[PDB]
From a paper:
The cation channel of sperm (CatSper), primarily localized in the principal piece of sperm flagellar tail, serves as a pivotal sperm-specific, pH-dependent, and low voltage-dependent calcium channel. CatSper is the most complicated ion channel known, comprising at least thirteen components. The two small cytoplasmic proteins, CATSPERζ and EFCAB9, which are reported to be responsible for intracellular Ca2+ and pH sensing, have been shown to have their gene disruption linked to disorganized CatSper signaling nanodomains and male subfertility, indicating their important role in the regulation of CatSper function.
Notably, further improvement of map quality in the region corresponding to cytosolic map 2 by local classification and refinement yielded a local map at 4.8 Å resolution, which displayed clear secondary structural features, primarily α helices. During data processing and model building, we noticed a distinct additional density near the previously characterized EFCAB9 and CATSPERζ, which may represent an extra component of CatSper. We found that the main body of the predicted structure of ARMH2, which contains three armadillo repeats, can be perfectly fitted into the density. Moreover, we also tried complex prediction of the candidate proteins with EFCAB9 and CATSPERζ using AlphaFold 333, and the interface predicted template modeling (ipTM) score of ARMH2 stands out among all other candidates, which is the only one above 0.7. The predicted ARMH2-EFCAB9-CATSPERζ ternary subcomplex is highly consistent with the cryo-EM map. The cryo-EM resolved regions of the ARMH2-EFCAB9-CATSPERζ subcomplex are primarily in areas with high predicted local distance difference test (pLDDT) scores, supporting the assertion that the unassigned density belongs to ARMH2. Notably, the residues that potentially mediate specific interactions between ARMH2 and the other two components are highly conserved across mammalian species, suggesting a conserved interaction mode of the subcomplex. Interestingly, although Strep affinity purification of EFCAB9 still pulled down CATSPERζ in the control group, the CATSPERζ-to-EFCAB9 ratio was lower than in the group co-expressing all three components. These results suggest that ARMH2 enhances the stability of the interaction between EFCAB9 and CATSPERζ, which is consistent with the structural analysis. Based on the structural characterization, we speculate that ARMH2 acts as a scaffold to support and reinforce the cytosolic subcomplex.
Numbering used by the authors:
A (entry chain B): 58 to 236
B (entry chain A): 1 to 183
C (entry chain C): 119 to 193
Write the structure that this text describes.
């Protein structure tokens, strides 16, 4: 029990050291995500304090490289599932509008320098947002609120899915209700 | 015993009430057991787990020696589920320093693993080299031999190990007991 | 009730499956390391003159295409 709690306590004390490169803290945040998911419920209300720092740094997406943003994509994807206090915590505290804000990435901003990593970013953000869906009623109303994303959802219907377990875009469009 | 940090076995969850693992974690481990069988015969071979413990631990080939013939209780060479699950249970129960609580209620299994040859009685030549698993030094081997041999013929018993496993969880009053012992 | 009900119930039917974690498709790097250690001990054992050699060769390209689908363009 408490050994997991104390070890994530000191590596969280690394996580609030500001004067360091971010990538070791990003794989540290991967360790919070995996250890909190393999703990259970009690690890999730233990780790209920620790989204302050990652929620602070997720608005600085225009500075760091693509590795950091895809790393907190699978950090929040590993953290989010089977977690009720999480899934009503995130839509009141700027997460799924921030994933919408993440999505403009490159369809109006950039065209190509090495733009394969861009569709890798779309792969990991859609796999992030399918596993936050659960069975509530709140979140797909504001997903219905936006306008152009359905058209972009058409674009993620167009692209081929290589070696994935199943095509998450078509079950996304099935769950989003614009059919 | 010091395992390598950052490994998968360092990410498991240990409970401090019955000293066990979860249903979803052993679901994950039967998925890795299913994918790790190269000839897919619902069983396990040796050198893969040998390299696995070389990655996750730091122990030389003698430890491979007595580990790989303690786990070969099936006496056919090819191993399976239960020995793998109980061995990963014990090796992730070493570092938590509450393994005395683990064989507080796992008496009959460590009987059956220490009964390497099926006569229900255990000699000193069996566990003289298993002291790496339980960090017991030779002076308290001498003390446990000359203080807890009701059998008296360098041999063990079921109720003797019941006294041994209620002895294992309360060592502070055991040092105050040996403080009282000469008086 | 109504078109709220009949869709989303099936999505909790989606919520039981094997459900790999996002790191379960990338935790096998040391599993590749220990099996490639088994390959180099196997090359010290018998070499290429053999056919269960060929089936573990089929296993190493099978996991090569199994890891390639996440590592074509990621590199």
């Amino acid at each position: 029990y408490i050994f997991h709690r104390e070890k994530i306590l000191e590596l969280g004390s690394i996580l609030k050291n500001k004067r360091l490169s971010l990538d070791k803290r990003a794989q540290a945040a991967q360790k919070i995500g995996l250890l909190s998911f393999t703990g259970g419920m009690s690890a999730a209300q233990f780790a209920s304090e620790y989204m302050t720092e990652v929620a602070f740094l997720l608005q600085k997406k225009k500075a760091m490289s693509f590795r950091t943003k895809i790393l907190l994509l699978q950090s929040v994807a590993c953290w989010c599932y089977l977690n009720p206090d999480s899934q009503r915590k995130v839509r009141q505290l700027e997460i799924i509008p921030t994933l919408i804000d993440f999505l403009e990435e490159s369809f109006q901003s950039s065209n190509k320098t090495e733009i394969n990593t861009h569709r890798l970013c779309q792969f990991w953000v859609c796999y992030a947002l399918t596993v936050i869906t659960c069975n509530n009623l709140a979140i797909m109303r504001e997903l219905r609120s936006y306008r152009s994303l359905k058209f972009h959802l058409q674009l993620v219907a167009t692209e081929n899915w290589s070696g994935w377990p199943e095509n998450f875009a078509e079950v996304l469009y099935f769950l989003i209700g614009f059919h | 015993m010091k395992l390598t940090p950052g490994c998968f076995l360092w990410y498991l969850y240990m409970d401090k009430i019955y000293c066990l693992l979860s249903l979803r974690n052993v679901k994950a481990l039967m998925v890795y057991f299913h994918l790790l069988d190269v000839h897919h015969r619902n069983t396990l071979n040796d050198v893969l787990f040998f390299h696995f413990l070389q990655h996750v631990t730091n122990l030389n080939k003698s430890q491979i020696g007595m580990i790989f013939d303690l786990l070969d209780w099936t006496a056919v060479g090819e191993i399976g589920f239960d020995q793998f699950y109980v061995l990963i249970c014990i090796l992730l129960a070493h570092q938590d320093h509450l393994e005395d609580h683990f064989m507080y209620r796992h008496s009959r299994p460590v009987f059956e693993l220490l009964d390497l040859d099926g006569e229900m009685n255990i000699g000193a030549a069996n566990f003289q080299n298993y002291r790496f698993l339980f960090n017991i030094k030779k002076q308290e081997l001498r003390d446990l031999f000359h203080d807890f041999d009701i059998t008296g013929d360098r041999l063990l018993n079921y109720k003797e190990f019941k006294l041994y496993t209620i002895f294992c969880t309360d060592k502070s009053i055991d040092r105050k007991k040996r403080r009282k012992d000469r008086e | 009730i109504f078109s709220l009900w009949k869709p989303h119930r099936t999505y909790w039917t989606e919520q039981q499956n094997r459900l790999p974690l996002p790191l379960m498709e990338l935790m096998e790097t040391e599993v590749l390391d220990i099996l490639k250690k088994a390959l180099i001990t196997y090359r010290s054992t018998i070499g290429r003159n053999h056919f269960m050699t060929k089936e573990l060769q089929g296993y190493i390209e099978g996991i090569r295409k199994r890891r390639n689908k996440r590592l074509y363009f990621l590199d």
